[PDB]
Symmetry: C3
Subunit: 313 residues, 3 copies
Amino acid sequence: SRTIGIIGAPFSKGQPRGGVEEGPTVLRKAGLLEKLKEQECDVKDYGDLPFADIPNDSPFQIVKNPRSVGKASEQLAGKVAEVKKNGRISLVLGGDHSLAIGSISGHARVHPDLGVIWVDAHTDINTPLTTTSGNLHGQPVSFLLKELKGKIPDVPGFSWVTPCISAKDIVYIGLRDVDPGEHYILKTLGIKYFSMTEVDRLGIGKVMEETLSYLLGRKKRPIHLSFDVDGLDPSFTPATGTPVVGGLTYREGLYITEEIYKTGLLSGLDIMEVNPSLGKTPEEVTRTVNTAVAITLACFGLAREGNHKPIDY
Amino acid sequence: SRTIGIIGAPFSKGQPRGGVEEGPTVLRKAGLLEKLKEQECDVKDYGDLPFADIPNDSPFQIVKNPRSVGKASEQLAGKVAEVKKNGRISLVLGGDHSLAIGSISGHARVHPDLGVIWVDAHTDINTPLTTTSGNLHGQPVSFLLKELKGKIPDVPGFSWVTPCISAKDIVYIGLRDVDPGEHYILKTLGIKYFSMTEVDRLGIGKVMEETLSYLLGRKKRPIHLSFDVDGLDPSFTPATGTPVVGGLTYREGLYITEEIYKTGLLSGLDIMEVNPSLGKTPEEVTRTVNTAVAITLACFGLAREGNHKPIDY
Amino acid sequence: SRTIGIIGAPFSKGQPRGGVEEGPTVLRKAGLLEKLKEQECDVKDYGDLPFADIPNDSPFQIVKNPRSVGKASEQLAGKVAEVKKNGRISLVLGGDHSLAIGSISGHARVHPDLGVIWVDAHTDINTPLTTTSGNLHGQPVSFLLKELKGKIPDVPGFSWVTPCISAKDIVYIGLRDVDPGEHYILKTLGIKYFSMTEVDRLGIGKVMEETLSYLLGRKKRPIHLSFDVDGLDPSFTPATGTPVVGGLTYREGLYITEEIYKTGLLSGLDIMEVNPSLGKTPEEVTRTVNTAVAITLACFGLAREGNHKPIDY
Ligand SMILES: N=C(N)NC[C@H](N)C(=O)O
Ligand SMILES: N=C(N)NC[C@H](N)C(=O)O
Ligand SMILES: N=C(N)NC[C@H](N)C(=O)O
Ligand SMILES: [Mn+2]
Ligand SMILES: [Mn+2]
Ligand SMILES: [Mn+2]
Ligand SMILES: [Mn+2]
Ligand SMILES: [Mn+2]
Ligand SMILES: [Mn+2]
């Protein structure tokens, strides 16, 4: 049965807007733990990581808050590796996606053979040298790829990092806003991806069939799902820092996760970029969090066709 | 040509909210009869069933308004069997889905070999003993299935009922909120269904291909379509008692019905759960009724590709 | 590389509502030229056609403003043929779709072998004798089809017209509101089309596969894409004269154009029916124009998966 390890990560210095550090709060008050337990889920809450304050953290070239970001991920990596050693699926209620660096890092320490599925409107694969924004939530994957070692300069706060995944161990789904440098990296490293164009062409059904086959083809291995809230259309998750029109639908979002759950291989989960303060109205915030919870519950068994206990009703 | 028999069924005691008894009214004033006639439809209106008032109708265990519900369906069954004997397709403009009991019952009296397609966000297959809500609009199918005879206790008002369909003669489409007892019944009786997950996986095209093949495989037989308005997403039909996000789209709704029409086998039709009083704004009511009419017109020939008469334009 | 020739066509007398003549304006101020240049596009703006005023233009039977419409298209045809001779893809920022007559006409003068893809909720194939509205924006295709020569009476202003395409050289996508006479013409001339029903059945992926195969089967030839803004659902392009619910999605709209771009055969493009004055709110106008620009940029290379230059990033 799916045993979960909850990790609240109220961090925002991976991007300019601040309300994202409130993500764990709103998701918890939405009753996420209760609802997960309302299922057959064994849930242990490891709490909200107390993220230090690094007042002295000047830019590294154009890269912003490098020491703060580097420290949050280093802290998070230890936590994630802790829950993984406790035999539970790590659920990181995040702030910004920069935390992916620590989440996937800590997960790989315990399961070096993990495969990653990255649901996002963006690739977040900019290097400190290709980024034009300097925001680290758009650079996580670059720190994690072994093939990019030698192209990632020494950024204050990330000396603890060691690339744990190969370009062949990750699949993107939902892309619709990729920088030119990021696109160059995609095609150069031969990274497997399904942009909104491929979802439109093939259908989410075929997309998931190919994604799982691609990652679990040679052999079965742990799965790390890093779900960026903006991967879904802004009509479903408006309270997010960088929304892009024409995203994955609510149904597609649930299909992605229902399928992953069914592999029985989900090992790590990230629910990122939910920023309640960016909701233009009280219900945009409610609509976003509700959708984020729904997708989280899907990862752990909630099926739209229904569920029932091993009893004769 | 599609000859129709209209039956207004202003009934609401199958669920707690009352505005649903206004369904026939708003659908008629939307010009449904005129529009149907604006097509090549032969339409005879059998009127709005005068539903009796049963002041004395205490709960049966937890089941609410059993005598009122049982009587409305018994009345409706006779009407439907009447129009079927008049060689016309029964169109039941309903209130709540509890009326399905009488609609399908009366239809089967004349055509015991009918197949049922149930478009709904719910299975409505709870028994008086599995229901937790006590609302009869979520129990109709349980009264109709032969295999469940022996599990349906004697509820005041339904002694006239006799299960007329087998688990193999029904197909669900659109499910996204099924109780645990209902899910147990689905898998136990081996009922064929396409939840939103299957629609996402296969596409409405394949879904309809399999549905009709499944029901008309061995041989051609009359079709009864019980369309619950909440089977479509609440962005299309918001004025309904129990809306559930992530529903069938407008297009899918029309595709379902255009395909059924084309079989030339539509024998019975239910348009249920439209509740004008639940629309939060005047246009939510207009948007709901408009969609309900559009889907009704599709059942009787209106095609999105166009239609034309046997003349040289 | 895609070299473009911009042609502003502020014309509205092809239909009753007037704000459509503002289409070139809002599209230009949305930064369309800048954005196209922000790509690898060679853009030359031929300006906004100064459309004459024909005060004396009484109806022809029921056909409205025939001389004004006929003159605008005649003018436009010369312009389009001019840009085509300059070796550039004609981009007609239009007013109403009646301009299609001149756009496709002028294009065919230089490339008589062109194939047409018509994205629209309507067929716009009514003849002066089949039309019931008398509005010429719903009759363009009838003037262009060789097979309909002999059925198009002499309308003041169109004596310069000479049917340049056969029924076999055009494909419709998005149809959902076709008159009976139009439908008769579709089936009689055996015109290939994909109404919303076919998109629902096959998926936009298969639809585009069949469309391009159909038109480029025997051999490769120039493509003329006449994109009517109302071909997309009104939730994306509300500021348009004749919206119809259940249209093509934003994603589908981009998929259509991304695919066409990739053929490397786009030869002519029409962006029609954008009417800023019909937007009920300031953002409905913004949402419409934004979508119209997005689809225009897709026609010329902008891909959702990303783009990059031939350099080592
Ligand atoms: N993670 C995001 N939103 N990335 C977008 C943009 N390429 C940036 O790297 O700042
Ligand atoms: N028909 C509905 N809405 N059913 C839902 C719920 N299972 C109930 O049986 O009350
Ligand atoms: N182009 C449009 N909107 N056509 C619709 C209608 N058949 C008319 O020809 O006026
Ligand atoms: Mn993102
Ligand atoms: Mn991201
Ligand atoms: Mn329902
Ligand atoms: Mn129902
Ligand atoms: Mn149109
Ligand atoms: Mn048009």
